[PDB]
Amino acid sequence: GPGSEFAAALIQRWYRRYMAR
Amino acid sequence: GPGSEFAAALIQRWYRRYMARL
Amino acid sequence: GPGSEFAAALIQRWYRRYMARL
Amino acid sequence: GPGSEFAAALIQRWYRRYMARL
Amino acid sequence: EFMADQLTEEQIAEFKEAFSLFDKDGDGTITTKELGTVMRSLGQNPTEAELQDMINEVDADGNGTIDFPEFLTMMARKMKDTDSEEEIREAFRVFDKDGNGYISAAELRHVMTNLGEKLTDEEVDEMIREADIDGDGQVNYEEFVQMMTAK
Amino acid sequence: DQLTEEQIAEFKEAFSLFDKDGDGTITTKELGTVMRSLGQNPTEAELQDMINEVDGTIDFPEFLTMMARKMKTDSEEEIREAFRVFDKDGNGYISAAELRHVMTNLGEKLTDEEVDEMIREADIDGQVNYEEFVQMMT
Amino acid sequence: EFMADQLTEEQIAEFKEAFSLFDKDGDGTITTKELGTVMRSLGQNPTEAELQDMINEVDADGNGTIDFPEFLTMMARKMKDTDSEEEIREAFRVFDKDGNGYISAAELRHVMTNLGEKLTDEEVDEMIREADIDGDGQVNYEEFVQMMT
Amino acid sequence: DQLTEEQIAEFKEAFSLFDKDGDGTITTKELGTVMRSLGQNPTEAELQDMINEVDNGTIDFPEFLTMMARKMKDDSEEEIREAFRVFDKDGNGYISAAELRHVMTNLGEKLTDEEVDEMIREADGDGQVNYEEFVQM
């Protein structure tokens, strides 16, 4: 589902920004 | 609303008068 | 008494200052 | 009475202004 | 007796409070781009083209900064402007949500058909064909009004 | 000249709104306008008083001194209040009849000519709106 | 011409009739000491220092006598003086019964805390400490008014 | 920006609470204090980034207004919270460590096993992630 891919990537982008600190 | 109806009506009155002058 | 005289005088000074400019 | 309440209140306003100016 | 003829004490005070708030270096001038926020401060919601007009009114056409006497003149002329052209521009701007000086063909059509002395579909067809001036979909209402100002 | 750091910066900004050329100078025909920009309602006589204590421009330093003096002096308030002494119900009116009695019997007693002149100038049934009569003699 | 601009016919008569009572010797001049009783005869009640200000107005300070033109100039000026300082000076003089230019610290405390926008004890404590200039328990208010200006 | 009459006023008064001298400026070391006075709760690193943009150690009202309008137009941790919610049938604010791991490793820009171990390790616990907490970071 395009919607579930979207939701997953949003979380993923925030998690990589976090660990980039 | 009555306010928006009057703006719309001002534009109609003005266009019609311009068109009627050709 | 002294307070009423004072109130009346202040008004009179301004009233007469006003008429002097006219 | 009212008259010497005026005189008081004029002194008081002026004094508070003076003290506000520090 | 500068502006004693035109504005009231409390108007001049309100204009000062709004204008000075954007004076960074305190020389008595704001960047003209602040003029939007200065009018929003005052409970107005003017269009881009509206502010370009207020600026033109005083010969500050792209003058980078704007004087307070200049800002006073603008306000005091626009408060008393009963010119017909200005009524027509103002009526259109009630339908320009953002204030970019345009209105979707679809939106204009919707207003002309459902509000007021409601236009017919033939009548409004002919208006979009004439007002959709410069490309398709978007109506430059300021030019539309320019077009039917002459002749 | 006992103004605060904040008043001085407020007056400097107000002064420079009218200093176009930026030369630390405003015309006296603009003194009223700057004071109104500062949320004041200076009287025509308050402004002559000021514009005359300078024999036609005002440098920032003689402005700051006018403004410091104008703080340290509230003519509209004090005349209103002098009238309010003789206004019991507190409604801001006074009878032509009681006003005449007070002016011809208290203080620097008005003549019958002077009060006849006062009452005519106070409009109106025959009740004097004294807050507007304050405006008249400013 | 003279005084026709500033006084009415009727005032010039009143002031004449009041000033004339103290011209013993037909000079057209009164002893300065008598200016208080002249002004009391007009139903006024000025203070010692109010009177010095009037003599001062027409450059007659420490003169033995006052002219009638002098007198007319004092009155015409005082009748129209809306000066802020004078107003504050005439409010203080309301509470100066004898007119000597002093108000007891206790009498000043009383008016300041019982009349008008009543001062708090804090506020009037500050006031007396600055206003009792010498410390004697007497407020020379005229001087206190010099300070506040 | 396209800001409110009331909001510009709200934000001027907030600003003037920290302008003691009335010189139209506040210190950077008082920025957090003013935004907290507006009931905003900015994160340490949310201020550092706002402050460098400025870089006197001082902020005038126009660039303060700007900073605000930049946070007020954009949006929030509400979207992150919501993206998790997509993976939470219950809606009890809790996602299992096993499901979260499977979603991160398989959907979207798949996380490495490297990454999804450091995520779960800092997301702890009882093998039951409480995603509101984890969005707090």
- The hierarchical CATH code for the domain H5-72 is 1.10.238.10
CATH of range G84-148; options 3.30.70.980, 1.10.238.10, 1.10.287.3510, 1.10.1370.30: 1.10.238.10
**Which residue among G94, G119, G126 sits closest to D7, beta carbon to beta carbon?**
G94
d(Cα E34, Cα E30) in Å, to the nearest integer? Answer: 7
Check: CATH 1.10.1200.10 for F5-71? no
Resolution at which this structure was determined, Å: 2.5
Query: Does the beta-carbon distance from C12 to F107 stay under 8 Å?
Result: yes
d(Cα E16, Cα E31) in Å, to the nearest integer? Answer: 15
Sign of the C-alpha dihedral computed for residues E80, E81, E82 and E88 taken in this order: negative
d(Cα H119, Cα G36) in Å, to the nearest integer? Answer: 98
Element (H, E) at H114: helix H113-122
d(Cα E135, Cα F3) in Å, to the nearest integer? Answer: 62
Q: Could you tell me if H103 and H111 are in contact, meaning their C-beta atoms sit under 8 angstroms apart? A: no
Whether the CB of D15 is below 8 Å from some CB of chain F: the reply is no
Strand partners, G65: G31
Residue written as tokens 């008004």? C11
> Fold for domain H77-136?
Recoverin; domain 1 (1.10.238)
Instruction: Provide, for chain C, the percentages of residues in helix, strand and coil under a 3-state DSSP scheme, each rounded to the nearest 5.
Output: 90, 0, 10
Q: DSSP string covering chain F, please?
A: ----HHHHHHHHHHHHHH-SS-SSEEEGGGHHHHHHHTT----HHHHHHHHHTT--EEEHHHHHHHHHHHH---HHHHHHHHHHTT-SS-SSEEEHHHHHHHHTTSSS---HHHHHHHHHHS----EEEHHHHHHHH-
Nearest in space to E36 (alpha carbons), one of E23, E18, E24: E18
d(Cα E133, Cα B11) in Å, to the nearest integer? Answer: 17
Amino acid at E43: G
> Fold for domain E84-147?
Recoverin; domain 1 (1.10.238)
Nearest in space to G84 (alpha carbons), one of F82, F72, C16: F72
What are the residue ranges spanned by the domains of chain G? Answer: 9-78, 84-148
Q: What is the DSSP letter of D22?
A: -
CATH architecture under which domain G9-78 falls? Orthogonal Bundle (1.10)
Q: Could you tell me if G52 and G35 are in contact, meaning their C-beta atoms sit under 8 angstroms apart? A: no
Paired tokens of E12: 């001049």
Query: Does the beta-carbon distance from B11 to E148 stay under 8 Å?
Result: no
Burial class (CB in 10 A: 0-12, 13-18, 19+), F88: exposed
Residue of G nearest to D19 (CA): G148
> Fold for domain F75-137?
Recoverin; domain 1 (1.10.238)
Which of chain E's residues have a Cβ under 8 Å away from the Cβ of B2?
none
Residues whose CB is less than 8 angstroms from the CB of residue E11 and which lie 6 or more positions away in sequence, other chains included: E75
d(Cα G145, Cα H59) in Å, to the nearest integer? Answer: 44
Nearest CA-CA distance, residue C2 and chain F, Å: 9
Total beta-carbon pairs less than 8 A apart between chain F and chain H: 8
Nearest CA-CA distance, residue F76 and chain E, Å: 15
Which of chain E's residues have a Cβ under 8 Å away from the Cβ of H3?
37, 40
Nearest in space to B7 (alpha carbons), one of E120, E142, E116, E78: E116
Whether the CB of A2 is below 8 Å from some CB of chain H: the reply is no
